[PDB]
Amino acid sequence: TPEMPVLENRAAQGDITAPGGARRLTGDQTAALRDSLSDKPAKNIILLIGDGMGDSEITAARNYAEGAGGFFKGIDALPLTGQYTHYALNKKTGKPDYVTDSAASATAWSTGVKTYNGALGVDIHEKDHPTILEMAKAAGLATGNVSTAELQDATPAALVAHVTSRKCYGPSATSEKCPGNALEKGGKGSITEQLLNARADVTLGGGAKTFAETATAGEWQGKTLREQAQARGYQLVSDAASLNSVTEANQQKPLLGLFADGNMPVRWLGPKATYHGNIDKPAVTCTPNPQRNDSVPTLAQMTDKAIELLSKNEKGFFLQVEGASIDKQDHAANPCGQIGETVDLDEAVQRALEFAKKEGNTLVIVTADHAHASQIVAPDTKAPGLTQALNTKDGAVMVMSYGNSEEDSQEHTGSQLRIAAYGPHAANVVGLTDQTDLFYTMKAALGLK
């Protein structure tokens, strides 16, 4: 529908050195904005998550790939924008914990309740709360869960599992780490077991490794999680062609793609940032990963296939898409890997917007779970941490800094960050909101109960 606009061009209008040449706007937006506003219900929801993708991450990615005055055709094209809060809680005390982990934040948008770092789908009392995915299914909508990380990862795990600890990937760890959730101890089972019972129509990502584990109890005791899966009607695909083979996906034949043992591979490679690296070493140009593969679907590809299959459902669908590795490359102080995963997410965002523009009843949301370490600093900066100078598209140098940990891993940060939307009920992300509001916004746009 030409009905709801998406920003087609927010790139610098001309010569950046000239008056007005760096403007991104061509004229007054009031009218386009009014036209972007609708309280009609949403038929479908597409939620795209850049893990650790705060404003700095987006800017850095844009500067590198599109140039300072460039524009991300997906990420930057959502018309309605705001800033949201993602603080977690201290388990003991119930008081805010300013810097969340990936499990607590995902639990927030998936269930509408704040929790402690490490928790999945449970509150500070270890009590279960239904996820939006479970809710959609209950209502008859098609449901999809897509990520580039292991499927047991906090991010996608959060829609289908309720455990006291995120580490409880499979039976083995669970019995150790989440006794109360251990299938045998009467619990609901490990993340993977819970994933299997959740039965989303479409689930694609990595983490095949854990499906090799064997059940300690239940109907499928003694057999592998993969066998349990085939035994349950799941359709197991492991590569792009097999995924492409796919013509239908539903409750009779849910789809389960396991494209890697661990996390899917990153798009781009570069060296790790080093002490005084912008000073002592030469500017870097990122290298595409030669081992990413033609047999491995990209996020944009999983995205497109997910949309085709779920769109068959007349009642509608809920779809979560995660660009997982932005966060992990940020933790590794790897500018190139971080940037590449952001550009990768932008493509998927483009696919989503393409569909929603045509479809007309789709709310598309782009945001992150929390902020991260990466900072853009001056070229001749002398920093106490890890730095790297990069060669951008503008043909100039950009320096990135990771100065929040002396440990082998750079930390998340608590800054509020960008949330953006297009479609019905998108006004709900404008201004200041909390991460928990996202849950009530989605539940309400769909009319779930």
Binding site for Mg ion (CB under 5 A): 51, 102, 155, 324
Q: Which is nearer to a copy of itself, 7 or 348 (by Cβ)?
A: 7
The runs of H, that is alpha helices, within 112-153 are: 132-138
> 323: helix, coil or strand?
strand
Q: Among 8, 361, 320, which Cα is nearest to 134's?
A: 320
The reply on whether position 283 binds a copy of itself by CB under 8 A is no
Q: What is the DSSP string of 205-261?
A: EE-GGGGGSB-SSSTTTTSBHHHHHHHTT-EEE-SHHHHHH----SSSS-EEEE--S
Q: Which residues pair with 150 in a beta bridge?
A: 206
**To the nearest whole angstrom, how small is the minimum distance from the Cβ of residue 336 to Zn ion?**
18
312-371 binders of a copy of itself (CB under 8 A): 371
Q: Which is nearer to a copy of itself, 246 or 279 (by Cβ)?
A: 279
Question: What residue 198 binds from Zn ion, Mg ion, a copy of itself, none (CB within 5 to 8 A, per partner kind)?
Answer: none
Cα gap 44→262, rounded to integer Å: 30
CA 151 to chain centre: 12
To the query of whether residue 102 is one of the catalytic residues in this protein, the response is yes
Q: Among 145, 63, 57, 60, which Cα is nearest to 326's?
A: 57
The reply on whether position 102 binds Zn ion by CB under 5 A is yes
333-362 binders of Zn ion (CB under 5 A): none
Question: What residue 203 binds from a copy of itself, Zn ion, Mg ion, none (CB within 5 to 8 A, per partner kind)?
Answer: none
Q: Is 39 annotated as a binding residue?
A: no
Task: For Cα atoms 206, 207, 212, give the angle at the middle one, nearest 5 degrees.
Answer: 135
Q: Which is nearer to a copy of itself, 80 or 161 (by Cβ)?
A: 80
**To the nearest whole angstrom, how small is the minimum distance from the Cβ of residue 261 to a copy of itself?**
30
Task: For Cα atoms 88, 92, 94, give the angle at the middle one, nearest 5 degrees.
Answer: 45
**To the nearest whole angstrom, how small is the minimum distance from the Cβ of residue 203 to a copy of itself?**
26
Q: Is 370 annotated as a binding residue?
A: yes
Q: Is 86 annotated as a binding residue?
A: no
**To the nearest whole angstrom, how small is the minimum distance from the Cβ of residue 212 to a copy of itself?**
34
Cα gap 393→285, rounded to integer Å: 10
The reply on whether position 241 binds a copy of itself by CB under 8 A is no
95-124 binders of a copy of itself (CB under 8 A): 95-99, 108, 111-114, 123-124
Q: Is 153 annotated as a binding residue?
A: yes
Cα gap 399→377, rounded to integer Å: 6
Q: Which of 36, 56, 102, 401 is catalytic?
A: 102
Active site residues: 102
**Which residues fall in the annotated binding site for Mg(2+)?**
51, 153, 155, 322
User: Using CB under 5 A as the criterion, which residues of the chain lie in contact with Zn ion when the complex forms?
Assistant: 51, 102, 327, 369
